[PDB]
Structure 1
């Protein structure tokens, strides 16, 4: 289930983080706007940019912590506040996060593996709700 899935993702985190974040940027091309330097790049080109691998892995490092500290896929309000307040997220609306989680669930559904895609979908929804509550537009 959810907790095992955190262990699975952490076991190959660099490759899952890149592959899910590329899935997100390819499904929702307008989202590359937040990351100007990513425009006009193939997946392979992106995977060779230092910044890409480092920000993607740090996103997933913190996403897995937030998932790990959740009760029944409901994240801590303190984690939601941290995400809303980060000055790298000044731009962002819950829609940015909704789309990331749609791509993540899709990725899990398409994978050969017994990911608990329904739990991730609930986690995404509950995070978006927690982010709204903590004051994200």
Structure 2
């Protein structure tokens, strides 16, 4: 289920964080609007790079903590507030977060593995709702 999937992802976090964020960028190419340093790069080029590997892993590290601190796939209001009030998220709308979670759930369904994709879909919905409540547009 959801907890075990946090353990699975954390067990190979660099690889999963890169693969899921490339799935997001390829599914939603307009989302490179928030990442100008990533335009005109193939996935292997993006991986080779330092900002990429570092920011992707730090994003997934914090996403797994927010997942871990959730009850029944409902994140803490404190975690949503933090995500809304991060300077690096000044540009962002809940739509950016929805897209990331759609890509995450489609990655999990396509994997050969027994991820609880319905729980991740619920978690993404619930985080978007929490982000709205914490004051993201």
Range into which the TM-score falls when normalised by the shorter chain: over 0.9
Describe the superposition over 1:8-45 as per-residue Cα deviations: whole angstroms up to 9, x where unpaired.
00000000000000000000000011010000000000
Normalising by structure 1, what TM-score? 1.00
Query: What are structure 2's unaligned runs of at least 5 residues?
Result: none
Query: What are structure 1's unaligned runs of at least 5 residues?
Result: none
Structure 1 SS opposite 2:48: coil
Cα RMSD, aligned residues only:
0.2
Normalising by structure 2, what TM-score? 1.00
Describe the superposition over 1:55-96 as per-residue Cα deviations: whole angstroms up to 9, x where unpaired.
000000000000000000000000000000000000000000
Between the aligned partners of 1:36 and 1:111, the Cα distance in structure 2 is: 29
CA drift of 1:111 comes to 0.1
Structure 2 SS opposite 1:18: helix
Runs of 4+ in 1 over 4 A off after TM superposition: none
Structure 2 SS opposite 1:47: helix
